[PDB]
Amino acid sequence: VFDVGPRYTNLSYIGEGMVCSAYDNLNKVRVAIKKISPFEHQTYCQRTLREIKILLRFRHENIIGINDIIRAPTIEQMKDVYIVQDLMETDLYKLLKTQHLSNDHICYFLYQILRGLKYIHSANVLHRDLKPSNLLLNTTCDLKICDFGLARVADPDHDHTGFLTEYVATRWYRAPEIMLNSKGYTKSIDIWSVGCILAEMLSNRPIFPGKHYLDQLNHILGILGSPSQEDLNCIINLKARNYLLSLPHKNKVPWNRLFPNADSKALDLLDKMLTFNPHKRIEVEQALAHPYLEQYYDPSDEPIAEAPFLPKEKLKELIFEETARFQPG
Numbered sequence: 001v002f003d004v005g006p007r008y009t010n011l012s013y014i015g016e017g018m019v020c021s022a023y024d025n026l027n028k029v030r031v032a033i034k035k036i037s038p039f040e041h042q043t044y045c046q047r048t049l050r051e052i053k054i055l056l057r058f059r060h061e062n063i064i065g066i067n068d069i070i071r072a073p074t075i076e077q078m079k080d081v082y083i084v085q086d087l088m089e090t091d092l093y094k095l096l097k098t099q100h101l102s103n104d105h106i107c108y109f110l111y112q113i114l115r116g117l118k119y120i121h122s123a124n125v126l127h128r129d130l131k132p133s134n135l136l137l138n139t140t141c142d143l144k145i146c147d148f149g150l151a152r153v154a155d156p157d158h159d160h161t162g163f164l165t166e167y168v169a170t171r172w173y174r175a176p177e178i179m180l181n182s183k184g185y186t187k188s189i190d191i192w193s194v195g196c197i198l199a200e201m202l203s204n205r206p207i208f209p210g211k212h213y214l215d216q217l218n219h220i221l222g223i224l225g226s227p228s229q230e231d232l233n234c235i236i237n238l239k240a241r242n243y244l245l246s247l248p249h250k251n252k253v254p255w256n257r258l259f260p261n262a263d264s265k266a267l268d269l270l271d272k273m274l275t276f277n278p279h280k281r282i283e284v285e286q287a288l289a290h291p292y293l294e295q296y297y298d299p300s301d302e303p304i305a306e307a308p309f310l311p312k313e314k315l316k317e318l319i320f321e322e323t324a325r326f327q328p329g
């Protein structure tokens, strides 16, 4: 049951709440709708409150926006919530598992990813779950970052934690520091993902397909090779450092080897993005200004945010209030 009033008609399943494609009789165009009703499960409401707030605040060409939201007129009657967004032709995930991207395509995709990330980060926000399935693409290959479900506000000061700390974000694109002593409250956590995403656009397959928590880590050290003495020193947590030391030595696999068909500049940037020590990992602005993206880099055309961005009763009430602007009057 997809009850989205009269304005939106001609429904049809799209993916998995439930996402469908409807025609906007008011905009003479088609759009996508996402049905959400996790209210029962508190462990699924704050994620809806976060994204809505972050997505309405954000305004960027490379970031998906909310064109409209649907819900009951009263908090009592409000059950399901319908978020409406622009309908894209596909995503990086489906494209990677069927198409071969040319160097020019990779360059453009990388640029659009970083351009929007720059805005996200400029608003002191971390995406934390960037990956192909979260990058929508239209027929002309324009890219848009989506799903700020796990996004948070940067909090570098309180990013340290013990060894083997549970993490939600997709395993394959998790930064090595996450399985060691990082809680994921630093902007470098997003650059690492963009990194993994680059490698994937090069060989059409995830770079570090870990099978489990540690498998992700041992899969990373496989290419980068054992972390240097300096990088380890940075790590203070005894449990974490001793694990890296217990591990056998691993040589570094040369990028020009994993992707001999890649572009040297791109590989040079891939190197900066996939750095074991987060503190030395390149920044988004430094990535946009990298020689690889030289034909696109334009700081004046790369907007930044204008300013830095619960019981089972408040979340519903809060979400209800955050969705009022889309109600008549």
Ligand SMILES: Cc1cccc(Nc2nc(Nc3ccc(CC(=O)O)cc3)ncc2C(N)=O)c1
Pocket (backbone or CB within 6 Å): 014, 015, 016, 019, 032, 034, 064, 085, 086, 087, 088, 089, 090, 091, 094, 136, 146
């Ligand atoms: C499958 C799925 C899962 C989660 C969200 C969407 N939603 C969206 N889907 C599209 N087009 C879209 C339609 C189909 C696919 C996969 C395929 O090739 O069949 C990928 C993207 N465009 C925008 C959104 C959006 N704004 O949410 C689609």
